[PDB]
């Protein structure tokens, strides 16, 4: 097809193979953390962790949507004046 190059990483066996000390959370790490904490937090309220349907995040995103529509109407009537 387009001949893609799946991410790879070998070894080093030399001097520059243990010098970096760069702490920077990549997108994957923050996604993984979100998911792990939403599979634990759904293991002490639902008592099953097959994670097929999560209602907790549903509740939280519902209250968030309430907040966002709140601020939207706030400014959309602030423009009214």
């Amino acid at each position: 097809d387009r001949r893609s190059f799946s991410s790879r990483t070998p070894v080093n066996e030399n001097p520059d193979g243990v010098q970096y000390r760069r702490g920077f959370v990549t997108r994957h790490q923050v996604s993984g953390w979100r998911f792990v904490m939403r599979r634990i937090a759904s293991g002490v309220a639902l008592h099953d962790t097959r994670m097929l349907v999560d209602p907790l995040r549903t509740q939280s995103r519902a209250v968030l949507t309430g907040a966002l529509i709140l601020v939207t109407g706030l400014v959309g009537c602030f423009i009214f004046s």
């Binding site: 387009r2 001949r3 893609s4 190059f5 790879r8």
Partner: protein
């Protein structure tokens, strides 16, 4: 005159892994 010499075992010189490293080809520009 000349003193005598013996035949030891030669110290093993540092090795040389004569490998044949294989690089993987690049991508192909989808467009």
């Amino acid at each position: 005159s000349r003193l005598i010499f013996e035949h030891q075992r030669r110290l093993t010189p540092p090795t040389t892994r004569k490998g044949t490293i294989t690089i993987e080809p690049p991508p192909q520009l989808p467009r």
